[PDB]
Amino acid sequence: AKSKNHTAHNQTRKAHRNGIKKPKTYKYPSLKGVDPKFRRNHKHALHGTAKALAAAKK
Amino acid sequence: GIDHTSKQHKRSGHRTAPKSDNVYLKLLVKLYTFLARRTDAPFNKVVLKALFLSKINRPPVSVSRIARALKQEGAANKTVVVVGTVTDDARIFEFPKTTVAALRFTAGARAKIVKAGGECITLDQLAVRAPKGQNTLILRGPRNSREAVRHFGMGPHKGKAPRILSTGRKFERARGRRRSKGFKV
Amino acid sequence: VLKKNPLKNKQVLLRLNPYAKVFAAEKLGSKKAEKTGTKPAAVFTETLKHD
Amino acid sequence: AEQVAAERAARKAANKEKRAIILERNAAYQKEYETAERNIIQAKRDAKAAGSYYVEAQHKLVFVVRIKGINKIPPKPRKVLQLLRLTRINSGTFVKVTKATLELLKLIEPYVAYGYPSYSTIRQLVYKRGFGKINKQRVPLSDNAIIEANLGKYGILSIDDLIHEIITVGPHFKQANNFLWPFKLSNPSGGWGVPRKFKHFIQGGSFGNREEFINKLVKSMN
Amino acid sequence: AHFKEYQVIGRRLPTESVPEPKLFRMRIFASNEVIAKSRYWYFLQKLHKVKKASGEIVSINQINEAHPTKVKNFGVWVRYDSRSGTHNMYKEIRDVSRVAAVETLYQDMAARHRARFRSIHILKVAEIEKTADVKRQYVKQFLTKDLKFPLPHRVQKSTKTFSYKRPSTFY
Amino acid sequence: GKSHGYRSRTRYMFQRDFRKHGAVHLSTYLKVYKVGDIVDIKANGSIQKGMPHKFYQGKTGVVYNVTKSSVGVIINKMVGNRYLEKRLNLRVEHIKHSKCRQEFLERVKANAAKRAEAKAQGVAVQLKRQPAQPRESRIVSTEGNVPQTLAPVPYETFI
RNA sequence: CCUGAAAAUGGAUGGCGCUCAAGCGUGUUACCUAUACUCUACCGUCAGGGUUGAUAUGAUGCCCUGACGAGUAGGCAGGCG
RNA sequence: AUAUGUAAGAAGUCCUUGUUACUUAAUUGAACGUGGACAUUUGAAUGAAGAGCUUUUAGUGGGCCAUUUUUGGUAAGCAGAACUGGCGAUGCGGGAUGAACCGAACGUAGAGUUAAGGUGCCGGAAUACACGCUCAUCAGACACCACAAAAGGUGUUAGUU
RNA sequence: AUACUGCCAGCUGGGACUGAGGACUGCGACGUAAGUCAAGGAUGCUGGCAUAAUGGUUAUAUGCCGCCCGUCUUGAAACAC
């Protein structure tokens, strides 16, 4: 009692019903996976930038 | 025949004529439909759809949240409009002299408003005293801070509060949740 | 309530266009042209009739 | 406020002025068409007299009519037909000729009949079957007031201005064509002239680029 | 339908390196202008390194016969494809026009060899009027002197289904 | 049994080249990639560390991370009915900048130049690109170019 | 076109029948008709809207406009008993 | 060749480097940012029937058949893959008859026009018009398709030397 | 002049189906102005019966069409249940 093993029939149609729309993009992407040295530096630089901006517009 | 691109006879996907059988809610909906139709005020339109909104989509807004909205710069004298229930917060010890328009007020919240000196008014009084929503500020409660939403979207590597009944040791804290027991999620 | 098609119902045609009126008045659908005898090239006729 | 005498007089004066300016514009358009045609003819004659050949400028506008049904059509031609608004059989649309649109037409060759329409057939199509796309609704044009209200930002204030833009494709041809709802033509009154439609017009069929015969085909279908 | 004689002249697209290309001309029998341009491009592709995208057609003019009301013999050199191979042949036909001549040529090709317009190329069509030059008996038999013949067994077409006397085939 | 390895069916794809074997020229190491740069992936068969997968061979992505000898590239890969964002740690030998992005940046600079020129005098710059328009009318001469008539050639064996 | 070319109940270019065909190859061109296309009426669905002038229409009321309509497994809605 | 990855800008382009514990020999770079300049061609075409997003759940998890690519097999209405379109789930007109072929998809009616297929009669529509070819003491007659070959015949017709 | 092709907001004729719809309205046309129109959907005139005449129901007859339902199934009218 053998049966059909595999097929890609109807798969593209099923995908394209409500499918291949592009993923949504963001400003300020996640900083995970980037160099942790750069992460520490960016954290300190952002803190300093916020402090300086508050000082500039008190 | 027509080679259709969109789905035929597709409903709006939004809410109108709210499921509540409250005759008074129907009266408010009628008044604000008239206001939105004959006024062109975006405040009127948004208040109409907020009236259409359901319960979990109308979270309670606390007097502390209203106080924060008033502490916003240039918003001390704005009529705070919430479409829902205003609850009393015991974590604040001061209230300003604002006017609050809302569907429902808890006893403690209404007492807080009138003791601070402001007035609790309904949406019909808000309409009669501000047909275009002049000098109004709409408040909304946190919709995504409930048990259901914390359970929603559960899966591997999401961290979304697994649907459980008993919480503690030996209740889903094992193989599949720590490296010492098989894998970690 | 009912669509009235131009190219018939001259009333609707004139409602959409008064140049229909002046076009009919001046008979611009059958308009003559001034004749000028610009003769072609012998090389042109020879190329056309070439075997 | 009677709104019987003064309002009516002001509205009628505005309408009369608009009609006068529409008439002036239509006269200018007719003069331009006649001048262009006669200039083409004299250019050909001048080339012949000077011994040179006058090559006709490639036509800037085509009319394309989907003539195949909605069944058993591959995805890329189906999507191109949808993009050209050919979602039904015997359904027509005006197309500006560019490389992109020519590639689209080459893609959908076996399902459409397209060609180069003239002012006569363009006017026939617009007058007989003219429907605007207003609030996503197919309302008949039927009024220079409607056309002006929906295209007055581009200066198109009448069916004559719309037709002029279509025939002499201009800056706002895209907007005018998109305002024009796709034409729903009937089957040809005298038949298709061929025993079998789904061969190329060159091969004795009906689909493909019938360059100047689209005028006769669309006048029979309209 | 009935063929029409066209002269189609076109060139390659003029580039900066070589302006004013060679302006090749062809005489072709086609149903109308669209098929005329199609056949011109097909033959110019068969002969020269150029396609429709890389070239343009500078002129296409219909050619009417100089005298369409006098009988002249026509020698047609054609090449055609059969189910097996390609063959060149030469036919002679008596006709009043070149367009009608290629009409009968295509009809006779389809009748006698099942060759279609797809498979038939007309290499050359030459008008002639000299006797002892035509090589086909089925033309010389009509070019014989003082040619007169009857039409035996005349059949008269009837409009009604019933006729009330036996027909006569006299003439 | 079927075989689906990491480098399965990558024979010719990761085949190095013809007469381009051996060491790699140092321009590739000298190129500089910053975060946000669009880069093309073409795996080098002679370098075995940092090699991309055969799926990402020939794809284009955005640099999101920079490291000692590598670069983090983001590629949208179609998985089922959606694209997922895959992050690769590729090496500078396998990675290469995008001439398309360079051309677009050059066009942006040019476009700004023409807009500045328009602000100077306003000569209807028409910033946008237009497709291949149909060719207008032209007059072609026959002097020195009399048309040479062509005819179909008879069939011949030519063997 | 013919010879190659032989299977079992009686038998199938669908049948009758057809021979300058009602056969074959190719061309005009007229004509027939699908629940398809065009227009019109009506039904329903969907969408977009208008309406607080009488002391008459639960504004779930009235009205305008346009598009759409196949359906097993299945889902939901509105109704009958 | 067909398929296939990107880009075609405002989350953008140019002067102030303001912050940094990163980096540089170095106020050198890197990242982020404050101040300023850029409108109806905000940087190709076409379309968009409203973008986007979340929850929850049914049935399904035996498939089969065209046209192309293609594997095993002599082959199979055989077995197995790729893309697409269909049948399943679908009537309707045509192929006489048929799940898949050709047209075309379907609310209830009317008129007109056609598609595919046809017009001798069955059967609605030319025993049309035009050119040829064929005479079979097993003619031939319209795809999928319901079969025929090598070889041969001054039967007849048309074609270099 | 004339096979031809294209255009006419050119001129006449013969047929057919349809007649949807509202308490002031709109867009227009027509002699130097009264107002009328084919201009946001049919009216005018005239006949026959003041009834099974038209129709509804029903039974035959006639033309064409129509396989026995439910189920399993890729496939059922099935010589499958």
- The maximal CA–CA distance of chain A, rounded, in angstroms, is 81
User: In units of Å, what resolution does this entry have?
Assistant: 2.7
CB E8 within 8 A of CB E36: yes
Number of Cβ atoms within 10 Å of the Cβ of D147: 24
The rounded distance, in Å, linking the Cα atoms of E102 and E122 is 8
- Using CA atoms, how far residue C40 sits from D51, E5, E22, in Å, is 8, 21, 22
Q: What DSSP element (H or E) covers D37?
A: helix D6-50
The answer to whether D184 CB is within 7 Å of strand G is yes
Which residues on adjacent β-strands are paired with residue E78?
E89, E122
C1' of G81 to CA of B19 (Å): 28
- Torsions phi, psi of D91, nearest 5? -125, 125
Which residues on adjacent β-strands are paired with residue F90?
F71
C1' of I6 to CA of D212 (Å): 10
The rounded distance, in Å, linking the Cα atoms of E153 and E169 is 5
- The angle at the Cα of D217, spanning D214 to D218, to the nearest 5 degrees, equals 85
The answer to whether B9 CB is within 7 Å of strand G is yes
Instruction: Collect all residues with Cβ–Cβ distance below 8 Å to A39 and sequence separation of at least 6.
Output: A31
The rounded distance, in Å, linking the Cα atoms of B155 and B100 is 42
Tell how strand B120-121 and strand B100-105 pair up. parallel
- Cross-chain residue pair B3–D81, CB shorter than 8 Å: yes
Question: Coil, strand, or helix at residue D123?
Answer: helix
The rounded distance, in Å, linking the Cα atoms of B67 and B65 is 5
The rounded distance, in Å, linking the Cα atoms of E160 and E97 is 37
CB C49 within 8 A of CB E67: no
Which 19-48 residues of chain A approach strand H with CB closer than 7 Å? Answer: 21, 24-27, 37-38, 40-42, 44-48
CB F98 within 8 A of CB F105: no
Q: At D131, which amino acid appears?
A: F
Helix B63-71 to helix B107-116 angle (10° resolution) is 40
The answer to whether D133 CB is within 7 Å of strand H is yes
C1' of H17 to CA of F118 (Å): 31
Alpha helix stretches (DSSP H) within D129-172: 144-151, 159-167
Sign, CA torsion B43/B49/B52/B58: negative
- Cross-chain residue pair F135–E27, CB shorter than 8 Å: no
Which 80-109 residues of chain D approach strand G with CB closer than 7 Å? Answer: 88-91
Question: Coil, strand, or helix at residue A49?
Answer: helix
Q: How far is CA A9 from the centre of its chain?
A: 31
**B128 closest CA partner among B101, B151, B92:** B101
Which chain E residue shows the shortest CA-CA distance from D203? E35
Residue among D53, D55, D202 whose CB faces E34 most closely? D202
CB-count burial class (<10 Å; 0-12, 13-18, 19+) for D98: middle
CB-count burial class (<10 Å; 0-12, 13-18, 19+) for A40: exposed
The answer to whether D191 CB is within 7 Å of strand H is yes
- Cross-chain residue pair D46–C19, CB shorter than 8 Å: no
Q: Which nucleotides of H are covered by protein (CB under 7 A)?
A: 3, 5-9, 11-14, 18-23, 30-34, 38, 40-56, 62-65, 79-86, 101-106, 112-118, 128-133, 157-160
CB-side neighbour CA atoms (13 Å) of E67: 5
Tell how strand F95-97 and strand F38-41 pair up. antiparallel
Tell whether D213 lies on the interface with E, counting CB pairs under 8 A. yes
Residue among E20, E77, E122 whose CB faces F145 most closely? E20
The rounded distance, in Å, linking the Cα atoms of A22 and F85 is 10
Which residues of chain D are within 8 Å of residue F137 when distances are taken between CB atoms? 40, 43, 54-57
Question: Coil, strand, or helix at residue D91?
Answer: strand
Tell whether E165 lies on the interface with F, counting CB pairs under 8 A. no
- Solved with: cryo-EM
